């Protein structure tokens, strides 16, 4: 479900628009799920010139987060 990405930080990104869950794979190896993420956040994250900078600015710490790997 995860579309590949470029950042020095994250490898792939998946979205469940039906349930508002973002899923991010990171280059280190960890996979993390983000809850109640609005649609355009996922859109803006995917159309950012930098994917890693948008994540730390607008996503990390600001949505409920669970680890998956």
For a second copy, the binding residues (CB under 8 A) are 9, 16-21, 23, 26-30, 32-36, 38-41, 43-44, 52, 55-56, 58, 60-68
**63 secondary structure, DSSP code:** S
**25 makes contact with Na ion (CB under 5 A):** no
CA dist., res. 65 & res. 21, Å (int): 10
Structure tokens at 49: 């010139």
Q: Which does 26 bind (CB under 5 to 8 A by kind): a second copy, Na ion, none?
A: a second copy
Across the chain, the runs of DSSP E, i.e. the strands, are: 2-4, 10-16, 21-26, 31-34, 65-67
Binders of Na ion in range 37-56 (CB under 5 A)? 50-52
**CB of 51 or CB of 59, closer to Na ion:** 51
């Amino acid at each position: 479900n995860r579309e590949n990405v470029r950042s020095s930080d994250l490898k792939s990104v998946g979205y469940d628009s039906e349930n508002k869950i973002l899923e991010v794979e990171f280059n280190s190896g960890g996979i993390y799920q983000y809850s109640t993420v609005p649609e355009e956040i996922y859109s803006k994250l995917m159309s950012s010139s930098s994917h890693g900078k948008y994540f730390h600015k607008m996503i990390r710490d600001k949505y409920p987060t669970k680890k998956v790997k």
